[PDB]
Design a protein around this ligand. Structure first.
Ligand SMILES: [Cl-]
Ligand code: NA
Length: 129
């Protein structure tokens, strides 16, 4: 599923992400834009052989099992394929565990490089929430 901008904001708000650990809704939408282009089915392979999955590009070396990343952990306790569904529930819950582990949204390289310190509120302008 390829979300619209305001559609994804409303879905994110409903699942508890607005202001979660101090990050306003605009930050999560901006990170989803540059991680996956709003596409739940996006996958990308890293140099160490681990893979990134879904709307927020979650990594198989720490967070999910895909059966092909040796020695990795399954900290969110799911198969990585569940992160690709059109229902964003599993991606949201795992993301909540990630942003809580000490380093906040800095865990997402594209947030750090393209969203941090910008006007992230613009990402929800015009939306009915
Ligand atoms: Cl923080
Ligand atoms: Na894993």
């Amino acid at each position: 599923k390829v979300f619209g901008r305001c559609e994804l904001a409303a879905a994110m708000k409903r699942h508890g992400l607005d202001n979660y650990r101090g990050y306003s809704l605009g930050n999560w939408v901006c990170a989803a834009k540059f991680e996956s282009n709003f596409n739940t089915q996006a996958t990308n392979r890293n140099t160490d052989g681990s893979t990134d999955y879904g709307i927020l590009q979650i990594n198989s070396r720490w967070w999910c099992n895909d059966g092909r990343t040796p020695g990795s952990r399954n900290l969110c306790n799911i198969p990585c394929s569940a992160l690709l569904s059109s229902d964003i529930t599993a991606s949201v819950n795992c993301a909540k565990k990630i942003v809580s582990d000490g380093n906040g949204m800095n865990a997402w390289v594209a947030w750090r490089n393209r969203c941090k310190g910008t006007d992230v509120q613009a990402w929800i302008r015009g939306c009915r929430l």
